[PDB]
Amino acid sequence: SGVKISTRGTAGMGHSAESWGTGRAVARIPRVGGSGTHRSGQAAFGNQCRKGRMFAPLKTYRRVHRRVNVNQKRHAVAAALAASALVPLVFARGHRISNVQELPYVFDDSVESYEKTKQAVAFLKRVGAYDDVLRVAETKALRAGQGKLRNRRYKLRRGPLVVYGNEKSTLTRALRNIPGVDVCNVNRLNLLQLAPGGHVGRFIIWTESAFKKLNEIFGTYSTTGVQKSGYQLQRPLLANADIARIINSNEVQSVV
Amino acid sequence: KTHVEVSSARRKQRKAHFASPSHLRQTLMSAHLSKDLRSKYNVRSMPVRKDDEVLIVRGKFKGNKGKVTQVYRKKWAIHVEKISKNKLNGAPYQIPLSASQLVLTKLKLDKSRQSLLTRKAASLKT
Amino acid sequence: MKHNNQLPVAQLRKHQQFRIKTFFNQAAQKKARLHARRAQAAAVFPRPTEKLQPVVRKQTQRYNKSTKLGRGFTLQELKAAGISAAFAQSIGIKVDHRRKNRCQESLELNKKRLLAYVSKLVLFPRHQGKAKKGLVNDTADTSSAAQNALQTSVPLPSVSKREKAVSNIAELRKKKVYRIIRQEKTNQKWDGKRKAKAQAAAE
RNA sequence: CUACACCUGAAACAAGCAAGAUUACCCGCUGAACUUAAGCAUAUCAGUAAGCGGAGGAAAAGAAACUAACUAGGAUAGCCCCAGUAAUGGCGAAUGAACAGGCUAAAGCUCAAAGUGAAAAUCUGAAGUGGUCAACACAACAGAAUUGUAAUCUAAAGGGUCAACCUGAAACUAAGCUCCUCUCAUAAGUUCCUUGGAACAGGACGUCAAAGAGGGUGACAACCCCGUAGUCGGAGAGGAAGGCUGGUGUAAGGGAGAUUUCAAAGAGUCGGGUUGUUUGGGAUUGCAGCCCUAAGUGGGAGAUAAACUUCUUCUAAAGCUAAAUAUACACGGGAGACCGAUAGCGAACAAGUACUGCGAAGGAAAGAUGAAAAGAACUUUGAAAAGAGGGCUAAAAGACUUGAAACCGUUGAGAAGGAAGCUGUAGAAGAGCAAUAAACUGGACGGCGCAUAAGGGGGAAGUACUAAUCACUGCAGAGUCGAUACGUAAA
RNA sequence: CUGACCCGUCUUGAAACACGGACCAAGGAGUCUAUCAAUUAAGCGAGUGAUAGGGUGGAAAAACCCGUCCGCGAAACGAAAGUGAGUACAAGGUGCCAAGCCGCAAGGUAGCAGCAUCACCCGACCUUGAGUCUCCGACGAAGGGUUCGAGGAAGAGCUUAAUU
RNA sequence: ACGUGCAAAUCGUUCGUCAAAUUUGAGUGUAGGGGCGAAAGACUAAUCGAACCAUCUAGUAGCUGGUUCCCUCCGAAGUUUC
RNA sequence: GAGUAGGAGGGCGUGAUCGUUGCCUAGAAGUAUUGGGCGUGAGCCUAUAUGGAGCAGCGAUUAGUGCAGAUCUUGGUGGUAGUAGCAAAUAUUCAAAUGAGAACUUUGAAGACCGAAGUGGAGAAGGGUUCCAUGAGAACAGCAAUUGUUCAUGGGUUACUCGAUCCUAAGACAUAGGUUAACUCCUUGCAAUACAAGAAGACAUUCGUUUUCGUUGUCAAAAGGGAAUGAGGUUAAUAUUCCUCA
RNA sequence: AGAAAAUUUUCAACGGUGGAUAUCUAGGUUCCCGUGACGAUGAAGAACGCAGCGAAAUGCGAUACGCAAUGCGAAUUGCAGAACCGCGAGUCAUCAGAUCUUUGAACGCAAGUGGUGGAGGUGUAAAAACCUUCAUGUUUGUUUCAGUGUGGAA
Ligand SMILES: [Mg+2]
Ligand SMILES: [Mg+2]
Ligand SMILES: [Mg+2]
Ligand SMILES: [Mg+2]
Ligand SMILES: [Mg+2]
Ligand SMILES: [Mg+2]
Ligand SMILES: [Mg+2]
Ligand SMILES: [Mg+2]
Ligand SMILES: [Mg+2]
Ligand SMILES: [Mg+2]
Ligand SMILES: [Mg+2]
Ligand SMILES: [Mg+2]
Ligand SMILES: [Mg+2]
Ligand SMILES: [Mg+2]
Ligand SMILES: [Mg+2]
Ligand SMILES: [Mg+2]
Ligand SMILES: [Mg+2]
Ligand SMILES: [Mg+2]
Ligand SMILES: [Mg+2]
Ligand SMILES: [Mg+2]
Ligand SMILES: [Mg+2]
Ligand SMILES: [Mg+2]
Ligand SMILES: [Mg+2]
Ligand SMILES: [Mg+2]
Ligand SMILES: [Mg+2]
Ligand SMILES: [Mg+2]
Ligand SMILES: [Mg+2]
Ligand SMILES: [Mg+2]
Ligand SMILES: [Mg+2]
Ligand SMILES: [Mg+2]
Ligand SMILES: [Mg+2]
Ligand SMILES: [Mg+2]
Ligand SMILES: [Mg+2]
Ligand SMILES: [Mg+2]
Ligand SMILES: [Mg+2]
Ligand SMILES: [Mg+2]
Ligand SMILES: [Mg+2]
Ligand SMILES: [Mg+2]
Ligand SMILES: [Mg+2]
Ligand SMILES: [Mg+2]
Ligand SMILES: [Mg+2]
Ligand SMILES: [Mg+2]
Ligand SMILES: [Mg+2]
Ligand SMILES: [Mg+2]
Ligand SMILES: [Mg+2]
Ligand SMILES: [Mg+2]
Ligand SMILES: [Mg+2]
Ligand SMILES: [Mg+2]
Ligand SMILES: [Mg+2]
Ligand SMILES: [Mg+2]
Ligand SMILES: [Mg+2]
Ligand SMILES: [Mg+2]
Ligand SMILES: [Mg+2]
Ligand SMILES: [Mg+2]
Ligand SMILES: [Mg+2]
Ligand SMILES: [Mg+2]
Incomplete structure (x- = not known):
């Protein structure tokens, strides 16, 4: 993002504007010469003045993106997975694992061919996963302030993440519309889904192909x-x- | 959502809605069909017309039933017979209603209607 | 200008505001390239993606030890392959007319490459008619429907394993390398003055 | 001298072409100062602003008179590197490319010049005829043209002689696809309670989900309405400055290889001198004037001036050319750790508007009643504004959401003999739904209602031990995968 | 009752007869890009790290894999021509000095890192040379310096973020 | 006189000249390092010892002014050299 | 246990982003407080009132993140103060009428002024509906108003003879020719720095035919030149214009 | 205790001034992608007009907030009057056919003027009035021509 730069200049710079000079018992700031408009004689471009350019007009070329060494991306994903395996941690993250049994949670590829949503739900319910999903559902927030007008309407906490190994699996289409569910293909994994908020440990459901x-x-x-x-x-x-x-x-x- | 060309911006949509040209408005303001009619045409919702019979589902005026006097698209209002209030001077005035809070008891029937209904049912059941 | 730090090197001395380049298109651009490539495949379907490239040595003393993909085949090479430039082109072969062969081996590599190509080739003539040069291959090949990449079919291996011999050690040990390189450099150095001396003592 | 022909010029007429606009990106010119050198002339800012002339969807550039000297590479353009390097500079300030190498992208073609001379084989218009009738095919007649149109040709060749082996305008005739535009359609609660003016809230029961993006509905609604998803799906209409692919196939058209007394290529241009200017280009970076003014194994180039010997590389002085590249402009699409009415474009609004200036040019302020106008009926006092009654509404929220401070009025409690306020210490008066307070823990016993105690057996789960089993560590047979400067010319 | 000049500022010196400030709201000033360095946390280590680009991928500009070159380190000294850490079995000595091991203690043994010093080494500049050959210019047994270097002598780097 | 005017040059008295190098309307010629000047550096649209408009332009400032929340701790220099 | 310039270590408070824990039509944010408390302090929590839709904590990420000042920006307000002031251009007065109201409007009766170098009757420049009639709440007409150059509604500008239009002037611009990178610029009535540029007639009546004579443009004056009109009457507002007559 | 008021002054509540704060947004801003597509067949811009009741802004051009075609298939709406249920509503959309005043590269000449030429049409007894038409450059041609340019038969 940045502030308007155009033929005229950075925004707020759009006048031919002078400094009246010391004699007038007025401040030295630039004003707008002219006649006939109330804007006339009004202070010209500068931080201080209503209708003037910023302190550091903000540019496009501000470098936002950073690049991580591969080895550290990996080490990160690893330590993340390591974390995902201990009850104290995923419980510490706020996930609801009470009725869950054995972590890592791994299942059969019977899952990978799921199509309709209902069965992904029934699935979570059986496995005891569903509690966690329930939570995403019962805390659903309107975003505090500005965010809403910015096209992010709701804050939703993160639910269970499933890791499938079969490139063609339907578990994707299956879990889609469930709020809080997260689908990932094993071959490519995100520290971002693994540790949302940089917060280590999370509820994962694995496939066989996945796990292997x-x-x-x-x-x-x-x-x-x-x-x-x-x-x-x-x-x-x-x-x-x-x-x-x-x-x-x-x-x-x-x-x- | 599946499609990059679908605008998710509050602005754009609100804009579409209020900037709605008449014909599109009629669509935008539309009512839900009675169990009976739902079953008859295999169609959930229908855009309202000025000769239809409706039931107010929600409002101080919920529960009342009657004919649609005026579809005033500009004011966003639907008027229903005997849905008016009386003024101390003895002057009657209509009370406006949002379609999506209505229910269609009886349609105004005629060829174009039937064709529309037919298309909807068509994609539906098939 | 204060401390021990290295003398700065001015950057923004001119008006750079007009001269900045931004890289956000990159994201989409990569993608575009992908689809382009893909849409090439589909429109080229029976044929290979990249046209035939000969190989050469690189142009610098330091690069000589390496191998590089040439832009085109040397007319000399097409001759030893038995293809006309025009034909090779109708085939998907890449030809370069300014390149010249100063070594037997450079002929060899490219001959081997060409032949390899031809052997693995399938040619579709106007339906059910057969032809002669580079020839034309049977109608059943139409069913064979090969989508292939050139690196798979026409590649170039080298491994560094340097064989050992003792008799030679006994041999090589009798000369002196340093002395050699020295007298050689020397010879190049004084050649001119020496030849001039020959000429002068001759007249 | 006439007719007539040809060269040259002129008028009117027929059919076509240019004239302005556009601004972001592109081309050709023109071209400064502020600024930096802590002064200041060279320099820097900088080939930068302003100015002028031209375009396009891109422009320009492009098939070497290139690099490099190596076991070489090979059009142009962009990315990465080379690099802040070689070089330039009051060698101060500060300027500053390219080759090689990794990529993206790929594409090559047309002229002049011995050769129709068995014959202008060529180009343009055309009353007209067929047609998909503006776009196509023929066409009586006319012009252009030997101070030369078309076929061969363009140095990678080529002519001449052989030649394996190839091709197909005409006409006839079948089946198809691509892209664009405008339209039409699709899940599932309006069940029940409670608080609400409104349920879209909190509860209870339900559903759809390859749809829980986002909106609208009287409130933070997947299920009321538009939508979202299945949908590079289905259905209808019209398109191509008149899209694309077949089968027969004519006159005719090519040519690997082979050989041969053959083999021809751009002039006031290249090059030089001088003067400016420009580049890092420095005694030959590019360019421009003026003066010289060529050659024909000639001519360029080989980052130091001039000879002389040897080697290397390319063919200038004519043209065309997609892609990867640039876009603060226009109309469209979508988006955002932007801004949120003194912010954000100057303009959320009859904003480049009102208004000012002879003029060039300057240029603001100004968004939110309510779910619905239900926008205040009627009585009364007033000349009228308006007041008092009375009423709408969830509420006056009444020219309008919230409604801070400064300032001002009223009401209350105080205080003051040439100012006020304030640290430390006490006191008095005034204002008060009160924030602190003798409660709390236990023994024995009593009166009440609820539960079932300790101790003892018992011993699921837990921990600890421990053989038999078994993760892991170790050892490790057979299959399949991989690696290997072990080994082979490879295997 | 005791104590109490107007703040901000420049100044040796401000209550000053120094300047700004009648009052209030909202606005209002060390940022952003690049560069080198020091320090701190990270990864890997004689290596390290990509960029461009390829290939996949969520609705999505993410992510995930590949990425023969390149950067920077790994060799220096010279203007340069040029040479290169010279006995293959080396990688030292000395003074300060830590652990471990002895010893109740006194002290004894050992000697890591660093500091100081002497020695060796490569290259610049000097000086010297039997003999060798592709003998006119190169090679080298032996022997040296009052000197010069952003160097050797059992490699410490490279990428990331932050601060100054 | 007025001098926060009646007025960004006015008002009262007074005064120069008053048939010419007189006064005056319109139209028309001259434009910025340029005009135009019986010459005062005068005049050139309240602007002149170089108009006015926009731009380079937030021109540079060794100089003036400001520089926005709390606590705790350490704590200076006005000397040297160029 | 001092401290300016300065530096370091901890902490308070504000947006937005990824997380995590929650609060709100059974009332969020914001706002007022002589309600009750918590921090040494940035600041905090609560209560009550108002308000009527969104909020908050914790861990990180990021910053247009904290104001008493800059003759600081924009906006809003004071004290001065019911103060300075409303005094040039000789002047007004009486009765009636109208109106809620009259020193300021209309009629009449008196007294004065401009005194035909006007405070009169008409034009040019400039203004553009300010003109006429009817009506009138606010605002404006620096007191006032029943009145208006103001507001609202309707209505008004007639020409052969007036002027523009035509003519020429000081001048100016095309065309042609030349100059410029180009834009631009240079010449032209005594007409050219140009030049194969025209006009007329007749028959024909198109062409054509034919004849005659011929070097070639335009703009600039509402006081200059300049074909011809007068009197009387009429409208609420036009008239050398309409009507009547000549 | 000039122990009341008025003034000066502290604090609160209410009222008045004022428009901060909070919460919103058919706006801005930046990023990525798609097309470049004006004009003598008269553009960009300018003038004056066009609604039953209309100033502006937007649309439009004497067919004047609009005709036609096509798709949506019943409204417009501030008032009044009509039209339409499908012979089809509409301030709807789409848009491929029309209308397109005076101008402007701007075109017969000229211009602070609706002034004024030539040719043709019309009108008349003849006029007036009305109408259409004429700019410059250039590439071809067509027609008519000039040249003590070069040739040149009868
Ligand atoms: Mg002052
Ligand atoms: Mg659910
Ligand atoms: Mg692009
Ligand atoms: Mg001729
Ligand atoms: Mg042009
Ligand atoms: Mg500057
Ligand atoms: Mg300076
Ligand atoms: Mg330069
Ligand atoms: Mg164009
Ligand atoms: Mg660089
Ligand atoms: Mg390369
Ligand atoms: Mg024809
Ligand atoms: Mg002819
Ligand atoms: Mg639905
Ligand atoms: Mg109720
Ligand atoms: Mg509910
Ligand atoms: Mg919703
Ligand atoms: Mg769909
Ligand atoms: Mg120049
Ligand atoms: Mg030279
Ligand atoms: Mg060329
Ligand atoms: Mg009242
Ligand atoms: Mg209220
Ligand atoms: Mg008060
Ligand atoms: Mg009192
Ligand atoms: Mg007091
Ligand atoms: Mg008292
Ligand atoms: Mg005292
Ligand atoms: Mg004070
Ligand atoms: Mg004093
Ligand atoms: Mg001062
Ligand atoms: Mg990348
Ligand atoms: Mg290095
Ligand atoms: Mg040592
Ligand atoms: Mg006087
Ligand atoms: Mg100084
Ligand atoms: Mg912000
Ligand atoms: Mg309530
Ligand atoms: Mg807190
Ligand atoms: Mg309340
Ligand atoms: Mg924080
Ligand atoms: Mg503030
Ligand atoms: Mg303030
Ligand atoms: Mg005041
Ligand atoms: Mg006075
Ligand atoms: Mg008077
Ligand atoms: Mg008069
Ligand atoms: Mg008069
Ligand atoms: Mg004249
Ligand atoms: Mg003249
Ligand atoms: Mg006259
Ligand atoms: Mg008359
Ligand atoms: Mg108040
Ligand atoms: Mg119709
Ligand atoms: Mg012409
Ligand atoms: Mg003649």
């Missing part, structure tokens, strides 16, 4: 990734993340 390709795509501390073609997952800083174990063991306390 996961490894081929990424790899493991024995092997590199295929799809990422040489990506090695992060090398942990501490094998064991319980400092409990480590402060509290024999070796420690004997010496302590």
